[PDB]
Amino acid sequence: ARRELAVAYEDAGIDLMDNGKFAQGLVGAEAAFGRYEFDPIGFSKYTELVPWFREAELKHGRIAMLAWLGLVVPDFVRIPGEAYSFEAVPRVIDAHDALNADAGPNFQIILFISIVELCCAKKVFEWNSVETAGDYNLTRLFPEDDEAQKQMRIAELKNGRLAMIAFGGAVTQAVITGKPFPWTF
Amino acid sequence: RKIPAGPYSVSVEPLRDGATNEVSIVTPPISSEGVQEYLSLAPVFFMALAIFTSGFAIEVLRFFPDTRYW
Amino acid sequence: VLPYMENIPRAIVEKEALEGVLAMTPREQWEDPPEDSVLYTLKVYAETYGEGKATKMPWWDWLYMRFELPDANEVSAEKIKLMEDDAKIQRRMMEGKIPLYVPILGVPIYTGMTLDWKPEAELFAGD
Amino acid sequence: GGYKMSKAVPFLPMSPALEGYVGAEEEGFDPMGFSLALDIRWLREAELKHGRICMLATVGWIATDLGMRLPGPAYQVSTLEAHDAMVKFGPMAQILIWLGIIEVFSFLAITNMMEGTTDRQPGDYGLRRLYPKDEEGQYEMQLKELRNGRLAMLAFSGIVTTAVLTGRTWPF
Amino acid sequence: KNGRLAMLAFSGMVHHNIVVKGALFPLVPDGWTGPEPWAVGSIMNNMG
Amino acid sequence: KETSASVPFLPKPKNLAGWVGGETEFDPIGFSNWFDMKWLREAELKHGR
Amino acid sequence: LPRVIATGEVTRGGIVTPALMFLYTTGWIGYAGRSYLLRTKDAAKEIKIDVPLALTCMTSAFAWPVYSWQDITNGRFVAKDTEIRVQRMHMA
Amino acid sequence: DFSKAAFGSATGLVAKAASQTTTAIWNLHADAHDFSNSSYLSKQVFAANLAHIGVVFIWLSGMHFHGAYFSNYLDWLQDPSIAPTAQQVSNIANQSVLNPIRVTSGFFNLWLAEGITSTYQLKVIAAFGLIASALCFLGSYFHMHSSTSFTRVLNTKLTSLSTHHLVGLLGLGSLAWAGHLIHISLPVNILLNAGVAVPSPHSLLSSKAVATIVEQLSFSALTSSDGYVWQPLVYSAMHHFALALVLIVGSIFLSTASNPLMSFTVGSSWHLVLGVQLFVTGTASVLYAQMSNAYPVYPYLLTDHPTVVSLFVHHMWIGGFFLVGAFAHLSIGLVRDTLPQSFSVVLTQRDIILGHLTWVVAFLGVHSFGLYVHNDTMQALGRPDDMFSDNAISLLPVFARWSTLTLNSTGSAVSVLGVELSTADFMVTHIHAFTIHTTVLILVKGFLYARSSRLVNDKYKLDFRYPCDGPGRGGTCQISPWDHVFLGLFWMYNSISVVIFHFFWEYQSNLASIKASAGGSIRALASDFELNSINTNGWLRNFLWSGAAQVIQSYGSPLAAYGLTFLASHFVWALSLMFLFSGRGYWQELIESVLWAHHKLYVVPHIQPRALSITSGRAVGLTHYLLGGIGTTWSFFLARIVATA
C-alpha cells in the first residue's frame, strides 16, 4: 500500500495529532529479534516533526551510501583524466582538497546538488507527511504488495544507517591512517 | 482575520488545514492609478520639480560655464 | 476550565505550557483575551485545531504557530510563575515596607535589608 | 484522485498558477513555486522576453564569431571585446536608447494587461503573421516558441561562458 | 503626416549637422569611419 | 476588448474618435486622457507647420 | 574684479537684462501658482497636485505680464478690502 | 490598494478640514516613525529595523564603490603616507579646487585590515552590499506585510532572542571574523609588508599554503616576520576567538530567566528596550572612540592623523547622541505605560535623587569653572604662582597615576598607559565630569518628572511631547520629558564639544612634542595643551583662534570646502538662535499679515499657513543648533588636521 503520491499528498502538512504508535508508525524499528524502538533521547516524542526526522534520516543514509561507495571505488579505479589520476591525487580523501575552487568538478557537483535540493525543498517543507517522508517518486523497482514494501523500506533504512556509521569510520579511518580501501593501520 | 496581522497584508490566514497548494502572491497589490496618484503628491511633485530645476541649472552651468555672456 | 482549553494536542502547546499561561494570566482575563496577549493566540490556535477540528496544518503555518506560542520551559516554567508571584508580592509590600537596594557601579544592587520607608506619623508627608 | 502533479517534477503538485498556460499541460515545471509567490503573468512575460532576447543573442554571437561583421573599421573586433569597443564607439548606447523606447512601451503593455484594460496575453504583442488560425496550432506554436527560447537561453549561457573561458569562435 | 515627417526630418537634419560638424548635404564625408565619440564627462566617463 | 489600431498590445485611447489623424489611434502614453485634445491638435499642427 | 553696473545703462555686465529675465521668470512662477490655486480651490488638490492641470497652468503662465495687468485693470486680480479677512479686531 | 494606502496619511490629512493646515504636515512628519500601539506594532518595528539595515547596506555598498572607482586605494597601498582620497569632484561651477577630497573615515585602513588589495574586491563588496540591501528590503517588506506578529519577542520569546544574539549573532560573528583574520587578513598583510606579492585570497584556503608550509605557531616565519603593522591583527584574531569562546560558553552557563518587561505594555516595552539599547550603543561608541587612539588596531591608522581625529570625534558625538536618546526613550516608555509600577523606588525618591544630583552638578560646575576662572584672573593680574598649574598650586590627579598590581603573567596595560597627567588634565577631566553630570541631571529629571511633578500633577495625562501646561503657576513652559531631552541635547553638545576640544588639543600637543626632532628631550612643559589649557583665555587663544587659521585661510585651496562649511555652520547656528529665542505667536501674527497680502491678490492657499508649533519650533532650533555647532567643529578639526597633518 504505497498510496500513489498524488493521493498521498492529500494528508500532507505538519500533523498535529499522535498516532499512538512508535514514531508515527514509521517503518524502521523492525530489528532482527522483535522491534528495536530505539529513540533513547526522545526526539520521536516531538511527533509533528517525525516526518521531518524520517526525511532527514533517509537523505543522510542516501548521501552516506553514495559517499562510502565513492571513497571505496576510487581507491581502485579513477575517472579518465590527468586531474583524477592516482598520481595527481594519491588518496581519495585528498580528492576534496585537490580539485575544489577553480578546478571545476567539486564546485559543479556542489552547484548541481544545490539546484536539485532547492528544487526539492518544497517536498521537505510542505508536501511531507508520515507516509511520504523520503518518497521522491523514484519507486520504479519498488515491489508491490505491502510486506514487500516494508521489507524494502527497512532494507533502505538499515543500509543507510550502516553506511552513515561506516562513512564516519572511514573518513576517520583514512585521515588517521592514509591508506586504500582497507583503512586499517 | 483572527490571527493579528497588520493592515495591508499579503499574508494568507495562518489558520489553514493540511498543506494547501494555493497561490499567494507576495507582491504588493499596487494600482497604476494609485501609483500615479502617489507620484502626484505635493512632496513628490515639488521635489521632482526641484530636482528638474537643479539639474537644468547644472547643465546650463556645464555647457555655459560662468556668466560669459553678461 | 474553559471548553476550548480542554484536550488541546501537545503539538499546539504543552500541558505544562498551558498551565503556566493560565497561571500568569488573570482569571477575569479569560473568555476574551486581548489581541496582544499570549492567551488570545493560544485560544485562536486552540480552535480550528484538535479533536474533531483540523488535525493538520501547513509547514509555514506550523512555523508561524511555533513562533507565536510559548514552549513551556524557560518561558512558562513554574520558576517564572514563582518569580512573578514574588514580584507582585514585593510590589504589594513596598506599599508599606520597601526593600533596600543601593546603586553600586551605577546598577542597583540588593543588600538584603528591607526599609521602613513608610513615614511614622504622616503617611502623605513628603519629608 | 486529486492534486494534479507536475509532469516534470513528479513529486511536487503542479502550481495552480500554471493552469491555462502553454507549458503546464505537458511539463508544469515549477518546483520552487515561483508562480505561487509571483504573478504568473509577470513570470511568463519575463520568460518570453528572456527567451526572445537570448534567441537573438545566440545568433548574434554565431554571426559575430563566424566572421559576419558590419562593413566598418571600428567593427573589426572579436565578440569578447565587442561589448567594450562598441560601448566606447557609441552604438551600444544607441541600441540601449532604442530598446529603452521599446521597453517603455512594453512597460505600458504590462501595466495595461494587469488592470484588465486589454485582454492581452502575457507574451502577446499583436504580431500574428506566421500564427495558425486553429487553436491547437496556436498552442503548438507557442510551445515551440517557449522551448526554443529556453534552449537558446541555456545555449547562449554556455556560449558566452565557454568563449570567455577558452577564447574561440563557437564550435570550440 | 507631412508635419510629423518634417518634424522628425528637421530634428534629423540638426543632429546630422551636429555629428558631422558640417553641412547637411555632403552626408558621410570621405574617411568617415563613424562619428567622433561624444565629448564632455558623464557618470560613465569617470568609471561609473 | 477594444485595442488601438496602431498599437495592438495597448488599449484603444479615447478622445481620438472624431479627429483627422485619429483613425490610427496612436497614443501609448495617453496624453489624450490628461490634456485637452484641442490644445494637443493645435500644438501638433503648429509644430508640423 | 569685474563690476556690475546697476545704474540702468545697457552695458557689459549690466543689470537691466538680468532684471528683466528674472522678473519674467518669477512672474511666470507666481502666476502659474496663482492660476493653479484659482483653478484648484481645494486643499485636496493642494496636497495632491493635479499634475495635468498644474503643468497646464505652468506652461500657460508664459503670458503673465499682460494677463496680470489686464486682470489688475479689470478688477479680477486684486480683491476688495471688504471681501477678505482683514485685521479689524480693534473694531474699526 | 497598497499604492493607495502609501499616501493614506495625506488622504487623511486632506479628508478633514481640521487637518488642512501646514501644522498637519509637520505633525505628519513628526509622527512618522511614532508607531502607535496596535496589534502590528512589533511587526512595524522589526520591519523598520530591517529597512534601516538595508539603508546601511546601501551606504556600505556606496562606500566600497567609491573605494573601487573614485579612490586612490592602490596608490595608498603602495604608499600609506599619501592622502587617502575616495571622493572625486566633477568640474561644475568652479569647485575644481577641491577635486580630490581626503576622506577621513578610515576605510582604507579597514580594507587593508580585511586583506583587500584589488579594487575588483571592492567592486565585488559593493555589489554584494547592494544584494544584501535588496534582501533586507525584501525581508522588511515581508515582515511588515506577511509574517508573524513579533509581539512575543520582548516578553515571551525574550529568552530565545537574547540567547540567539549571545550565541549565534555575537559569538559566531566574532568566531567567523577570527577565521577571516587568521586565514586571509593575516597572510595578506604578511605578503604586503614583506612585499612578496599577494595571491588570490581563496588560494590561502588550500591547506598547502603557509597553513602547512610551516607548522610553527609563534612569531617566526619566512625570512624575518618582524612586521609590527601585522601584530595588531594577530591580537585582534586572538581576541575574537577568545570572545567567541567565552560568549558561547557563558550563554549556556547563564540563567537568562529574568524578563523585567512583564509589567510593561508592548509599546512601553519596546521603548524601554530601545532606551537601554541606545545606552549600550552610545557607551560602546564612546569606548571605541577612546580605544581607537588608546590602542592601535588598523594598519597605518595612527600615522593618518586626520583619520584618528575624525574617528574619535565622530564616535564621541554618536555616543553622546545615543546616550541622550537612551534617556529619551526611557522617558517615553515610562510616561506612555499604563501601570509603570516597576520604577516605584525611583519615582518615590524623585526629589531626593534629583536634589542630590543637583548639588553634585552645582558643586562640579562651581569648582571646575572656578579653577578655570581663577587661573584666568591670576594670569590677568600677573600672578602666575597663584594659578592652578604645575609651576603653581598643583592639582595633580593622583588617582590617575597608579595601576600597579601583582603581575601573574601580564604586561602592557598594567600602568597609566605610559602617559603622565598634570593639572590641566585634572581640570579638563573635571569639566568633562561636570558636563556629563549636568546632561544626566536634565535627562534623569525628565524621566522622573514625566508622570507627575510638584508643579503639574497630571503630566502623565499630557503624554511625552507637549509644549507646556500654560503660563499658570508662574509659567510652566518646558516641563515635558521631550523638553528635558531637548535641553539635555544642548548639554550633551556642550559636553561632547569640550571632550573633543580636549582630545584635539592634547593630540596636537603630543604631535608637536614628538616633533621635538630627536635630540630635544626636555619637553619641559611645552605641551601647548598642558601649558595653556588652564585658562579660558588660554583655550580661546591657543586652540580656537590659533587653529582657526587653517580653516579661515583655506580659500583657493582644497580645504575651501571646509571653510565654506565653517561659514554655513555658523549661519545655521545663528538661525537656530532665531528659532530658539523666538516664539510661535509672533510668527503666527506675521503669517496673518502675509496671508492677508496673499488674499488681497486672490492667491488664498487652502492648506492654511500656520507657523511651527512650540515643540516644532524648539525642535527646529535644536536641530539647527546641533548642526551648526557640530559642523563648525567638523570643518575646524578637519581643516586644521589635514593642513597641518
Ligand code: CLA
Ligand atoms: C536607535 C535609534 C533611534 C530610534 C529607532 C528612535 C525612534 C524614535 N524616536 Mg528617537 N532619538 C534617538 C534615537 C532613536 N530614536 C536619539 C539618539 C535621540 C536623541 C537625539 C532621540 C530623540 C528623540 C525625541 C526627542 C523624540 C524621539 C521620537 C522617536 C519616535 C518617533 C521618531 C520620528 O517620528 O521621527 C521621524 C524622523 C525624523 C523627524 C527625522 C528628521 C531629521 C532629524 C530631525 C534631523 C536630521 C538632520 C540630519 C542629520 C542633517 C542633514 C544633513 C545636512 C548636511 C543638511 C521613534 C520611536 C519622538 C517620539 O515621540 O517618540 C515616541 C520624539 O519626540 N526621539
Ligand code: CLA
Ligand atoms: C570654585 C572654584 C575656585 C576655587 C577652588 C578657588 C580657590 C582659590 N582661590 Mg579663587 N576664584 C574663583 C574660583 C575658585 N578659586 C573665581 C571664579 C574667581 C573670580 C572671582 C576667583 C578669584 C580669586 C582671587 C582674586 C583670589 C583667589 C584665591 C584663591 C585661593 C585662596 C582662596 C581662599 O581664601 O579660600 C577660602 C576658602 C574657604 C573659606 C573654604 C571653602 C571650602 C571649604 C573647605 C569647603 C568645605 C566643605 C565641607 C567638606 C562640607 C562637609 C562638612 C561636613 C563633613 C561636616 C584658592 C586656591 C586667592 C589667591 O591668590 O590664592 C592663591 C585670591 O587672591 N580666587
Ligand SMILES: CC1=C(C/C=C(\C)CCC[C@H](C)CCC[C@H](C)CCCC(C)C)C(=O)c2ccccc2C1=O
Ligand atoms: C522663524 C520661526 C517660525 C516660522 C517658521 C516657519 C513658518 C517654517 C517655514 C519655513 C520654510 C519651510 C523654510 C523653507 C526652507 C528655506 C527656504 C531654506 C532651505 C532651502 C535653502 C537652503 C535654499 C516659527 O514658526 C517658530 C515657532 C516657534 C519658535 C520659533 C519660531 C521661529 O523662529
Ligand code: SF4
Ligand atoms: S511661553 Fe510658550 S511654552 Fe511657556 S507657558 Fe507660555 S505658551 Fe507654554
